[PDB]
Paper text:
Among them, the multi-domain proapoptotic Bcl-2 proteins such as Bax (Bcl-2-associated X protein) and Bak (Bcl-2 antagonist/killer) are the gateway to mitochondrial dysfunction and cell death. Upon activation, Bax and Bak oligomerize and permeabilize the mitochondrial outer membrane by forming large pores1415161718192021. Various biochemical and biophysical studies have shown that Bax and Bak form homodimers first and they further oligomerize to form pores915232425262728. The core of the human Bax or Bak homodimer, known as “[name]-in-groove homodimer (BGH),” is formed by symmetric association of two identical polypeptides consisting of helices α2-α52529.
A fusion protein in which a hexahistidine-tagged dimerizable [name] is fused to mouse Bak helices α2-α5 (designated as His-[name]-Bak) was expressed. [name]-Bak existed as a tetramer with an apparent molecular weight (MW) of 228 kDa estimated by gel filtration chromatography, close to 210 (±20) kDa estimated by the quasi-elastic light scattering (QELS). [name]-Bak tetramers crystallized, solely mediated by the contacts between [name] molecules. In this structure, two [name] molecules were bridged by the mouse BGH, which in turn formed a tetramer around a two-fold symmetry axis (C2-axis). The BGH unit was formed by two anti-parallel α2-α3 extended helices in the upper layer and the two α4-α5 helical hairpins symmetrically arranged in the lower layer. The backbone atom root-mean-square deviations (RMSD) values calculated between the mouse BGH and the human Bax and Bak BGH were 1.57 Å and 5.01, respectively, indicating that the mouse Bak BGH is similar to that of human Bak. The X-ray crystal structure of the mouse BGHs determined here has the characteristic binding pocket formed by helices α2-α5, to which the [name] domain in the extended α2-α3 helix of its symmetry-related partner is bound. The surface formed by a pair of α4-α5 helices is hydrophobic and curved, suited for interaction with the membrane. In the [name]-Bak tetramer, the two BGH units form a partly open hydrophobic pocket in which the hydrophobic surfaces are sequestered away from the surface and thus not readily available for interaction with the membrane. Thus, the ‘α3/α5 interface’ was implicated neither in the [name]-Bak tetramer nor in the crystal contacts.
Residue numbers in the entry:
A (entry chain A), B (entry chain B), C (entry chain A), D (entry chain B): 1 to 64, 68 to 232, 1066 to 1144
The structure:
């Protein structure tokens, strides 16, 4: 359970910015939205500030914050992203479009204010004029994918792998082989995970109003590929839990038999209890007794408080 | 109902022996019979193995096994006698006759395998010849009496008060002021009482056949002094102690199972603690969990303080 | 708050017995009933076992257990009667009928079993043949009266005074000047009161069925004549009480503002609380904080437990 | 909002003095200006009272009053700076330049009646002449930065981490790795924080008129790092601490009033206690009583342990 975990508890705002060059066409882009790591939901609008954009959008969807993925509790000691926070992390990539060129990305994903920021620097090269890319042949959508995460301790960081599928107007498909590295800027302790992955599912819409080359992006991102946890710590929660999910229902209706048979009111309550007390303990002591006793008091209090 | 109680369901036999000294005349007496605590009944013959008994019989009736009282059903937890068994108890008293002397008695009421026994050491001092005692002036009866008991938790024992009236040939009466104390010798979970009392009624006969100086003796003896309030509560007070060792048993054996997993240090104890905690509750709450939880901080505080 | 107090908590059964002689006419009487000191109520039937009774009944109503009077809490350290218990007390009287003879009474009012007993011995003398008494001139009823109690330490007991009014068939009235003494049989500690009194009110009925000279008696008996108590101990209960009868209503609707604004459920409860905890205490500590905290938890628990 | 906080509602003046040694060249510098924490604003001129300043100005910008940050409204309880005032605090740090030397600094930020002051003692050691520092190679800017704070409760102080980037004429960059610690000197109820951070943005100008080696310096500085969860709880966490000293005050002065009535002994303490208790509750119960009650067992445990 990381400290940096604790930022993303609610919604968190987000700004993103990028300076691109691909085969010399330069450009820049800026975007805004919110993300809720708790529901593993993320919402964003992007606009190109050099006006028209030389590449089709989805190419960048990746490039454009895995801090916002939902890790459930058994897995929460594997959330690297949030641990590196607030000081953040550097995310470098190399994205190989198959049969075409490539992207190099470097980015700092860090907190500035109560805001989170992705500052990205991009260089594409060797693409082809009629390539899928420069021919704006890619459809406007995104498939789901899996992002495979494995710890790299030589770097006090992680390595990440996957491949991206951009459907084509044809019915053909284009592959983007994603190779990635995330290295904390902070010198603090981070969380290094066991191998696991993330399940991104995605949708690309547009803003009816907005007139500029833009993209509106939604991502759901959920963490998985582990079941036991640090197994017997969080598995303490199997038996301490049904110890109680049975203990409650064991005795609580002869408990109520005693309250329907002692009909206590606030006047007598104290005396009632205290008498049961010293007298019950004159028997002997263990905790085995000591518990039961106040089990009665919570259940007692409830009978008085409700009755009145 | 301590085991050592569940012994008296039916009849049980008895022997008694005593060695007196009173104003220098010594003697001994021994006797035999049975008693049934189920009905609070007792039966004995006493024959003086020194032949002539220098003191009137009724004086000794007291000295001469209170385990044999009927403890009624609601009171079963105030029987100190049926608890010290089978290991038994040492009963000693001091007896002040009005305008006359005293007896100090020491004795052990202990159990032997089947038969229950009283060996008694009595020390008389300072009586008057035309006095009631040495004159065999008190008549051959016994009255009813009440016997008042209070826990002395300081001794893991008990303390007792009563005072007895020996009618006299005079038509007068004589007092014997009795102060008594019991110190259970078996070291066990003896039962220590709330304040209460017992009521003797009694009779002295003789056997036509037997020619030795003797006495044949019967007692009905019953416990009381708990009326409705104290009953209906203090019954809740044991009925809770019952579920209190149902619990005590069933669980603290999956406990060591995990303490033997960590290896507490008193150092890391403070954290390891707050941690197994929050994860377990993330489930949900009622007390059924809450009890279970610190039954462990107790079986843990005992495993760090004992190992080390 | 006496130990012997604790017998009378519920209803307690009662037997009464008497051996009379007045001007030589001898008689005896026996009776049964219950009494509840808690409501200060007492109920009894009496029958004459020598058949017809030489005196009119009400003469005895007094003679025939002040243990059964209700002392309220401020006065409860003045209940002498119940303190002397279980060993009980001896009640002697002398009752002077004015212009007529007198009664002497001695009685032992003590516990035998779970039963309370009044054993009474009576001697009347010097009455007149046509006196109100032997002429059975007294009406059948009882007025209310006051019984004035003053402590007598020379006797580790009390002295008691009052005067009794037996209306007459005439419209005339007959006076019975009551002088009384109550001395514990027990050697224990008793409660010695400040001067105070008891307020008896009484009714004399008959049993339609029962054919023997009898009387059926009801007495309500309540204690009074004191207001402060041991004043500043039980007066602690003025300010510790409105400290709370205001404290409750001070903050409990912004408390509820926080629960209607935290909408807690059993899942999150623990986490919720614990966070408020260390963070609230990082401020500083006193108890002044420490209280408030769990004031929230009782009020929290109630919001979860009820909701669900 | 500690008093020592309620000081900064408006503008406040400032003086600064420093005495450096770096690779044996020493110097001193002193400066003047104002700052307003209400808007998180700060303004200063620095003039080198040794004339020529041997190190580039930006190096010192850091060393050169964090009380002047805007702590936003929800965060008011994490301001360690505005708490140590007026008595002030000692801030010392150590600064590691990459591939170059260090500065150790000691200083006291203390308040004098109206003006706030920094006297600084700086110790430089081991730098390189063609190095960035001694070569006045770093350009005349400053970047934005984030500053990360954690409570060190062990010092009743705090500990701090950040790292700063001085752009260089090269186009390169140089790091200055800052580690800092504050030990409040006034011994008081200082406020110790949850983990959080602050964000500087800054500018370096010069004055045309002034001919001494100088620097004119402005900082916007704001606190953040608490998002919704931790806010909405930890606001409950102070808002409870508020009612927690409403309470703390109002009452523990009728307390001594009664401890001064009894004369506890540690001996009779155990009973006197259980007793004032039951009588008070006989009234009725809710917690409003319960709190009040043991606020006393604490102000009592302190009156028996202190008197004796």
């Amino acid at each position: 359970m990381s400290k940096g975990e604790e930022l993303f508890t609610g919604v968190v705002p987000i700004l993103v910015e990028l300076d691109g060059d691909v085969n010399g066409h330069k450009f820049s882009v800026s975007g805004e939205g919110e993300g809720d790591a708790t529901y593993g939901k993320l919402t964003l609008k992007f606009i190109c500030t050099t006006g028209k954009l030389p590449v089709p959008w989805p190419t960048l969807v990746t490039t454009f914050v895995q801090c916002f993925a939902r890790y459930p509790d058994h897995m929460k000691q594997h959330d690297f992203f949030k641990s590196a926070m607030p000081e953040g992390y550097v995310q470098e990539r190399t994205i190989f479009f198959k049969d075409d060129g490539n992207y190099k990305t470097r980015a700092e994903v860090k907190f500035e204010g109560d805001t989170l920021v992705n500052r990205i620097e991009l260089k594409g090269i060797d693409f082809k004029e009629d390539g899928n890319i420069l021919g704006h042949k890619l459809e406007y959508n995104y498939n789901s994918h899996n992002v495979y995460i494995m710890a790299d301790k030589q770097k006090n960081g992680i390595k990440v792998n996957f491949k991206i599928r951009h459907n084509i107007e044809d019915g053909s498909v284009q592959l983007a082989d994603h190779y990635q590295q995330n290295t904390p800027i902070g010198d603090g302790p981070v969380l290094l995970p066991d191998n696991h992955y993330l399940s991104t599912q995605s949708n690309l819409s547009k803003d009816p109003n907005e007139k500029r080359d833009h993209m509106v992006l939604l991502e759901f991102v959920t963490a998985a590929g582990i079941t036991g946890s640090n197994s017997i710590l969080g598995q303490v929660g199997r038996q301490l839990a049904l110890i109680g999910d049975d203990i409650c229902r064991r005795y609580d209706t002869e408990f109520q038999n005693l309250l329907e048979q002692l009909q206590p009111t606030a006047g007598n309550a104290y005396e009632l209890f205290t008498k049961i007390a010293s007298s019950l303990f004159k028997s002997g002591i263990s905790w085995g007794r000591v518990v039961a006793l106040l089990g009665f008091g919570y259940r007692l209090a409830l009978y008085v408080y409700q009755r009145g």
